[PDB]
A = this chain, B = another copy of it.
Amino acid sequence: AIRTRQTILVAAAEVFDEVGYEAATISDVLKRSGVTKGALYFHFTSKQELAQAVLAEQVASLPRVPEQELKLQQSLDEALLLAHLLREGTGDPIVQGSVRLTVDQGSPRDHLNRRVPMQAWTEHTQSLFEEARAKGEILPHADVEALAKLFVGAFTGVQVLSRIMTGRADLAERVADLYRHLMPSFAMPGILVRLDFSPERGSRVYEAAMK
């Protein structure tokens, strides 16, 4: 049961990533997972429940990197880690599939709650910014709620454009560009000098998070 649920979920995420929710079927998930019909239907009744469980595990399946000196470096590290996990070279399969389900508009008919992962990303980002403000890293009257929405929104679209134009190959640089152009508007100048946008730190954070 324990690894079996995960095996099914990973397979469903890969199927949803390739064809989307509507074109996917339970049969495809069975083939890809390589588990019995019994094991699948023990954990999930339907395609709907599968896709909802993929969405519900989006945030928890991001590896958190150890707490940092600078909260804004933590925010930067997470965004570049997420960019790496979305690159198809080395997939986290849950994240890619979950993101596709979230961004794909779907139908009013389907019962997929796409607010849940976005609300969770927004709230997580807002907390980091609130913690950064208490540690003297942000300008005095920064609208931290509006900033969180901006970052989550902007990241999503940079990731979408990057998928369309390069299959996410340039995503690290697009995300670094985004953060380099947004952070000056609210970060204390003395924090900006200290932030590390390098690919080398991107690697170190990624390698540590995998094991």
Contacts and interface: CB of A to CB of B under 8 A. Distances in A.
Given A20-B104, A20-B107, A104-B105, A153 B178 contact: yes
Interface stretch (A46-54, A61-69, A160-168, A195-203): A160-168
Interface residues of A, number: 45
A144 to B, nearest CB: 12
Given A153-B160, A156-B160, A103 B105 contact: yes
B153 A157 contact: yes
A152 B146 contact: no
A108 interface: yes
A198 to B, nearest CB: 17
Interface string A96-113: 000010111111110000
Given A18-B107, A185-B184, A161 B152 contact: yes
Given A20-B104, A107-B23, A181-B182, A159 B157 contact: yes
A151 to B, nearest CB: 10
A148 to B, nearest CB: 10
Interface in A117-132: 118-119
Given A22-B23, A156-B161, A181-B186, 4 more contacts: A103-B160, A114-B164, A150-B177, A153-B157
Contacts of A161: 118, 149, 152-153, 156
Nearest to A108: B18
A165 B160 CA distance: 18
A130 to B, nearest CB: 18
A100 B105 contact: yes
A39 interface: no
